[PDB]
Amino acid sequence: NFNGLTGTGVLTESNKKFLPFQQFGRDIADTTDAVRDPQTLEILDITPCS
């Protein structure tokens, strides 16, 4: 529930470093693909488990 982004998925580190003002990312299907950790700024991908 990062800053109100409710969902379910597996979090994993990635090299997709966002911009300093950007918070989360989306794909061509308007689905959230990655989000940053508001405690320690790191990009974590959001993918369905199985």
Partner: peptide
């Protein structure tokens, strides 16, 4: 002292593709 004010207008000086900002933090 507040008595001075100068300005000029022409309704156009340039017209290019600028002023595009990030609409969201996505």
């Amino acid at each position: 002292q507040c008595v001075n004010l100068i300005t000029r207008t022409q309704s156009y000086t340039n017209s290019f593709t600028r002023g595009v900002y990030y609409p969201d933090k996505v």
